[PDB]
DNA sequence: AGCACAATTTAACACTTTTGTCAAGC
DNA sequence: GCTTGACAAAAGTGTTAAATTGTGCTATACT
């Protein structure tokens, strides 16, 4: 279009990272040591990024530009422009959540200054040097 | 001020080449079978070179000879 | 030249995956979310052939012998009971 | 092959090579007469790191006359 | 009308082109099947000769 | 401050057990879990149990896994003593520590007490396996299979012994002999163990290399206006031909639609058999080979 | 934990603060906030002043302060971080991948860990190290010391890419590289009219 | 010589048992391998190999080993 | 390291169909 | 202007052997 009006940030929330994605990455793979191929559900598996050549899936069964926006039954990649694969993202699923760097460690602290807690006593937290109180039962403290 | 010359800055790196050798000298005497443990079985001469080949590539210090001319070089 | 696919993800969320028409499609697709999904038309065939991992169970049993065993629990109940 | 390309191979009979064209040419805004030429094969028993069959280095000179637009002192 | 074990060949084809009971199988005409992607003579021949049996 | 120095700190907060407690902690863990698959066996065919049985059955577990947490605690300072001697291979020290962890983990799993040995003895083997396995799977940007960084590995050592023995490197072939394989073979071992770059390093002294790097599939304008033109002289000679001529030319080589066909299948919409159509077709390619129709097309040959 | 557990909750890492955000009023805090400048005017004031622009803000936008805490990181296009041959065979990539690499396998890990069961200092261990895997990813260096590669050259982070004259607003933005240009030497133009 | 003088540093390699020692003295060049002509032809690098004398010692078994090390160019 | 064994992938191959091609004739 | 049958190359297709890849394990004692 080229004329757009505002340009908006905002914190991205688990679930818009999680709408982005196309695909999650499950291993740390990047391409076979033989075929120097996208290792299938690594970084570069185009299963999930895309294509390396213009509808071209993995394995080859649909080549041809008949059929865009058809994904392979078998290699389950879409046939579509390779260019896809500048645009399109994934994602990771954590098994335990993580701090952004850049809102606990930012000067001030975002985090401290959002939770009133000191930015050495915050650190202690998220990398696991100390404790804190996350609930107290106030009824049940007191009636003991 | 000074001035380390070209021999001590060999002599530096060969420094640096046998210190890393020394660790696998001393824990290889460990984990080996003794009296089947030699001079070579306990020296393993990497990380010697490496200093070496290391230090004219990639360092500073060792350049390409300027030449254009003789005054140059 | 396509048909339109639809699975769910053990959590609930729905995906629609096109395929081609004249491809057999399949009743469990990997899903932009991360997870198995189960096709919603009719076959949903197969099991996968699940084999168990092996268990901590498993490798005490195959060193001791259930009766080793149940002496041992002998010894640890009889020293429980005598307070 | 794109059809357009394949249709004029039918009528002037070129059999689509099976393999691509990357060969050494004299960069942009160079030249001069050839001087020497070094080969290094691996068919001779020569030298070359592991997947290298066959190397050759080529040496271009020219006489540069005194120009408009070069620097003296 | 798995009891046929036919050849590999010819079951896929088949199934393919969506014979799931031998009762859809003889009512298709001989040149209805020859038609039928991948499928040749030595098919017919195969489902022919075990048909006689 | 440090990340393994906080990890040490707490691994040195346990205490190292004697080879008498080795054996307790050994013989809970296996009575827990034969409670727990036996209590489970209750669960399939019912007949509960008697409440004091119950109580102390699920306690007889519960001690069981303090025992399995007791066992490897103790034992942590072993693991890092082990993983010390791996670092600079490749893999993070911590990432070595917790790999370790891992063989310890199954170590106490597969342990037996009644041999009477030491738990060092058998756990140090467990420990090794699962940080070299580890640094296998892990330590190279691009992955090789454990059989093949085994080769890599023997291969290295070959050489270093060669190297010894020779005073000079070994060439391929020497390496092949003293490895039983072929001198092919061991090139492509080398070329396997090439390790990748990083285009973030700055060459310059001062620009960084990833952006000296060509996009190959990158459109080039003049070509693509020139297929473009080509495009263009195409349709017109292909005019100077017979309808069904141009027709057949074109779904032969799917000009149109992209996709050729075969003879068989333009006989179809002609009505004609496959050879009718290659008939046509030697008819027509003579015609376009013609010079005046082929005149023009020359200088688009490549 | 043995006496008063059943009385309370308490834990480490971002799981924790995770719930700190969870049990949280903006709008109380705020207000309370709000009259805590008002009456205690001093050096606290100015603390209870600064810490209301980051209270304030998440007021009025729509944003839940829990996106300062990640269960999905994203993972940035292949093209962006590229894994490519030079001429002649050798391979190389971006700096990312590794950093991708080291928090793909070790959330993997902490899987692992978890299934096992494993006591907290294994498991905790693993989540301190999934952190910090996280943070060299986004910001390298900005906590600790950097990761490194061979050379002891520190990764470049998805940081390292926005900021700097060489990042991508003055390298690639503000100006860049143009087609339909040249350059040479120049020598003196006396015949030359002016224009 | 600076070579001597990093090998004295080293000598002797001891564990903190002091059972073992592995001792280092006496280097050695050769010949040079090939020219300065023949390596700036060749694309290798002008270099003489370096020769050791290691000796490894036993304390409990009092047994010497003595053996002749190559270091590299 | 090194091996053993199961699991999985790749090649090789036999075999069947399809595609292009020729001669000959309607 | 067109079709038929004999025919060989080419292209798929299923069936099997070889190779490649993944995982478990190693019991003096070693923290
Ligand atoms: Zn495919």
Request: proline share 4%.
């Amino acid at each position: 279009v080229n004329f757009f009006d505002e340009l908006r940030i905002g914190l991205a929330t688990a679930d818009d990272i999680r709408n982005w994605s196309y695909g999650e990455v499950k291993k740390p793979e990047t391409i076979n040591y033989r075929t120097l191929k996208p290792e299938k559900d690594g970084l570069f598996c185009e299963k999930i990024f895309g294509p390396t050549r213009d509808w071209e899936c993995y394995c080859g069964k649909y080549k041809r530009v008949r059929f865009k926006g058809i994904i392979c039954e078998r290699c389950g990649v879409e046939v579509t422009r390779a260019k896809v694969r500048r645009e399109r993202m994934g994602h990771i699923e954590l098994a335990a959540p993580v701090t952004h760097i850049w809102y606990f460690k930012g000067v001030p602290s975002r985090l401290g200054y959002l939770l009133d807690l000191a930015p050495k006593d915050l650190e202690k937290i998220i990398y696991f040097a100390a404790y804190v109180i996350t609930s107290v039962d106030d009824e049940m403290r007191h009636n003991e | 001020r000074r001035l380390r010359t070209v021999g001590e800055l060999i002599q530096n790196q060969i420094r640096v080449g046998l210190s890393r050798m020394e660790r696998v000298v001393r824990e290889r005497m460990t984990t080996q079978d003794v009296e089947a443990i030699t001079p070579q079985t306990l020296i393993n001469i990497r990380p010697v070179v490496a200093a070496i080949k290391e230090f004219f590539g990639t360092s500073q210090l060792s350049q390409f000879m300027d030449q254009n001319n003789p005054l140059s070089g | 030249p396509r048909q339109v696919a639809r699975y769910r993800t053990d959590n609930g969320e729905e995906f629609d995956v096109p395929f081609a028409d004249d491809a057999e499609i399949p009743g469990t697709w990997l899903c932009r979310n991360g997870l198995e999904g189960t096709l919603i038309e009719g076959d949903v065939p197969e099991p996968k052939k699940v084999k168990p991992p092996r268990t901590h169970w498993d490798m005490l049993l195959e060193r001791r012998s259930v009766e080793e065993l149940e002496e041992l629990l002998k010894e640890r109940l009889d020293l429980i009971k005598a307070k | 092959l794109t059809p357009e390309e394949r249709l004029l191979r039918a009528i002037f009979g070129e059999k689509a090579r099976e393999v691509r064209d990357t060969s050494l040419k004299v960069p942009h805004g160079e030249s001069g007469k050839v001087i020497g030429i070094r080969v290094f094969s691996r068919e001779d028993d020569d030298e070359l790191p592991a997947g290298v069959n066959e190397l050759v280095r080529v040496y271009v000179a020219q006489k540069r006359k005194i120009s408009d637009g070069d620097k003296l002192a | 009308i798995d009891d046929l074990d036919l050849t590999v060949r010819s079951y896929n084809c088949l199934k393919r082109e969506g014979v799931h009971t031998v009762g859809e199988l003889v009512a298709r005409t001989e040149s209805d099947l020859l038609d039928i992607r991948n499928f040749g003579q030595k098919s017919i021949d195969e489902v022919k000769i075990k048909l006689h049996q | 401050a440090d990340s393994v120095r906080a990890y040490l700190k707490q691994i040195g907060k346990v205490a190292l057990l004697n080879a008498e407690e080795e054996v307790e902690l050994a013989k809970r863990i296996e009575a827990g879990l034969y409670a727990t698959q036996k209590l489970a066996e209750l669960a399939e065919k019912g007949e509960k149990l008697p409440v004091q049985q119950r109580r102390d059955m699920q306690w007889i577990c519960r001690d069981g896994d303090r025992a399995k947490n007791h066992l490897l605690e103790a034992n942590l300072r072993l693991v890092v003593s082990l993983a010390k001697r791996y670092t600079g291979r490749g893999m993070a020290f911590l990432d070595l520590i917790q790999e370790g962890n891992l063989g310890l983990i199954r170590a106490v799993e597969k342990f037996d007490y009644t041999k009477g040995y030491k738990f060092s003895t058998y756990a140090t083997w467990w420990i090794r396996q699962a940080i070299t396995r580890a640094m296998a799977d892990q330590a190279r940007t691009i992955r090789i299979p454990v059989h093949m960084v085994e080769v890599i590995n023997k291969l290295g050592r070959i050489q270093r012994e060669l190297l010894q023995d020779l005073g000079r490197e070994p060439t391929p072939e020497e390496l092949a002999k003293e490895m039983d394989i072929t001198p092919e073979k061991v090139l492509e071992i080398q070329q396997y163990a090439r390790e990748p770059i990083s285009l973030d390093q700055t060459i310059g002294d001062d620009s960084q290399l990833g952006d000296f790097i060509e996009d190959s599939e990158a459109v080039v304008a003049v070509d693509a206006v020139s297929f473009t033109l080509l495009q263009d002289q195409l349709q017109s000679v292909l005019e100077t031909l017979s309808e069904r001529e141009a027709g057949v030319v074109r779904l032969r080589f799917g000009l149109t639609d992209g996709q050729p066909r075969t003879l068989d299948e333009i006989g179809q919409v002609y009505g004609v058999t496959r050879e009718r159509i290659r008939q046509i077709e030697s008819k027509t390619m003579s015609k376009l080979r013609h010079p005046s129709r082929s005149q023009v097309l020359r200088d688009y040959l490549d | 934990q043995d006496r008063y557990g059943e009385y309370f909750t308490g834990a480490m890492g971002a799981e924790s603060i995770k719930k700190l955000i969870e049990n949280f009023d903006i709008d109380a805090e705020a207000e309370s906030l709000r009259e805590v400048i008002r009456s205690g005017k001093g050096q606290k004031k100015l603390r209870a002043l600064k810490r209301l622009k980051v209270v304030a803000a998440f007021q009025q936008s729509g944003n839940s302060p829990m996106g300062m805490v990640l269960d999905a990181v994203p993972v940035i296009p292949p093209e962006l971080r590229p894994m490519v041959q030079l001429d002649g065979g050798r391979f190389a990539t971006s700096d990312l991948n590794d950093l991708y690499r080291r928090v793909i396998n070790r959330n993997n890990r902490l899987k692992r860990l978890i299934d096992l069961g494993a006591p907290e200092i294994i498991v905790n261990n693993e989540k301190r190290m999934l952190q910090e895997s996280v943070d060299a990813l986004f910001d390298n260096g900005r906590r600790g010391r950097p990761v490194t590669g061979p050379g002891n050259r520190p990764l470049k982070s998805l940081s390292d890419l926005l900021k700097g004259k060489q990042g991508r607003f003055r390298q690639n933005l503000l100006g860049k590289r143009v087609d339909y240009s040249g350059r040479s030497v120049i020598v003196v133009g006396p015949q030359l009219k002016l224009h | 010589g600076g070579l001597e003088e990093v090998l004295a540093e080293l000598s002797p390699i001891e564990d903190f048992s002091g059972s073992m020692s592995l001792s280092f003295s006496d280097p050695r060049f050769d010949e040079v391998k090939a020219s300065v002509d023949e390596c700036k032809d060749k694309d290798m690098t002008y270099a003489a190999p370096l020769f050791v004398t290691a000796e490894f010692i036993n304390n409990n078994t009092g047994e010497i080993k003595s053996q002749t090390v190559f270091m590299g160019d």
